[PDB]
């Protein structure tokens, strides 16, 4: 006969990334279109990450939830080759989540929501005060660092600088060495692209899950149990998070 508040963490996007093949290979005039295909895959991932935010966002006191100490706590606790700025800025998504929180917050809503105790709710809110956000941020940071390290690697050539090889080796051998360097760099870029594809798929799954929650778990009632919340469902309280979404599911249990 008691209510509780459960915190759910769902990543919806990671750091934006893209490459410029005209500058990536050299700061062979044009090795091939393989790098162009890699850049196309990366910009497809970028568009997917820009769309995930629109999929999830913009789709008895409440001082802690309604502004936003929780949002600030998540902001400060959670921390070619150009990182593009996200299309939706932090304050865009903050305004969107605040507006949707205001929409879903409007003690008569408790009376109407019982069809499908202030101290218990206050205690559940207080006991709350981010692992997957750190996971994805650190993982993409390590991915970019590893890609830079592979860029610095000679990959069996005689140096890591194309201009140094041009000024140091004859053309009939400089072309072979540059071919080795560019093939190794494009192999590293292929590893980055495929890792970003699989991780983009895994973040798209979570973004679709979060969008479903933001459509039914926060709007109206989640008639389906165990989806969001430990038991029967009353309402959810979304919270903007850096490269993620935080839900505060208010559940009712016997």
């Amino acid at each position, epitope marked *: 006969f008691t209510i509780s508040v459960t915190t759910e963490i769902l990543p919806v996007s990671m750091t934006k990334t893209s490459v410029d093949c005209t500058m990536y290979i050299c700061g062979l005039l044009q090795y091939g279109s*393989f790098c162009t295909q890699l850049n196309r895959a990366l910009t497809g991932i970028a568009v997917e990450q820009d769309k995930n935010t629109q999929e999830v966002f913009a789709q008895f006191n409440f001082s802690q939830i309604l502004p936003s100490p929780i949002e600030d706590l998540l902001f400060n606790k959670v921390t070619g080759l150009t990182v593009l700025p996200p299309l939706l800025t932090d304050e865009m998504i903050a305004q969107y989540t605040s507006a949707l929180l205001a929409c879903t917050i409007t003690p008569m809503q408790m009376a109407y929501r019982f069809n499908g105790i202030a101290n218990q709710f206050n205690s559940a809110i207080g006991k709350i005060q981010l692992g997957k956000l750190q996971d994805v941020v650190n993982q993409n940071a390590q991915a970019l660092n590893t890609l830079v390290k592979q860029l610095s690697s*000679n*990959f*069996g050539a*005689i140096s890591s600088v194309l201009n140094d090889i041009l000024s*140091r*080796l*004859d053309p*009939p*051998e400089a072309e*072979v060495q540059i071919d080795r360097l560019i*093939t*190794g760099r*494009l*192999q590293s870029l*292929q*590893t980055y692209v495929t890792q970003q594809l699989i991780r983009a798929a895994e973040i798209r799954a979570s973004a679709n899950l979060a969008a479903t929650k933001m459509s039914e778990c926060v709007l109206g009632q989640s008639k389906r149990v165990d989806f969001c919340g430990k038991g029967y469902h009353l309402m959810s309280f979304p919270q903007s998070a850096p490269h993620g979404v935080v839900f505060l599911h208010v559940t009712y249990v016997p």
Partner: antibody
Amino acid sequence: QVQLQESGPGLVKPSETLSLICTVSGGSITRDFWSWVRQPPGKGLEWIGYGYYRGSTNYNPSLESRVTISVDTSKNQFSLKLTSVTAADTAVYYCARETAHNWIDTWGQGILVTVSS
Amino acid sequence: DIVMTQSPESLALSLGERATINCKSSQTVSFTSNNKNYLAWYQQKPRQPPKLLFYWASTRHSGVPDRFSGSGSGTDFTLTINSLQAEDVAVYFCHQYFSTPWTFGQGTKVEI
């Protein structure tokens, strides 16, 4: 037809520079990279590093701070100077002509060098 | 640093039969984009300089008879001496030229 012949002292004193000069007969010396592969007795071949007539050079990482190689086009030769020769450097040396993709084409009749007395 | 291993060692094969030598690499020795194996096979005769038998682990050099056939995929590499004769007695080894340092094989001596 490219032939490589080694020359140098068969006995080198410990902690003294080991100089081995490989002379190339036939073909040309300003054509490919030149390595100085080494085989210790009863051990697999060890790649010491490949030079170049332009002055370009790439040592083995394990021996980068002690190996030095110099290619002279005027005399059509290339020489290996191994410094700080310890007791474990006793081995046979093959001067090789590594091609553009850096696989050995001609190996050359290596010379055995040992440290004693 | 790539560790290159010759699992078959001291192959005592008679005349008219086949000897197989396997070279195993610690990691891949071929670029994923090109799928071109950066491995070579050499043979060394006693009191004689070694000779280049195979480069790219598939392509054959000049003067190599049809007896020797090389292949492989990624890490495993196979050299088969079809119809081995007395001329094939030597120490065969594998070389990688993918990334420095360029470690050779331990050397497998094929005895009659």
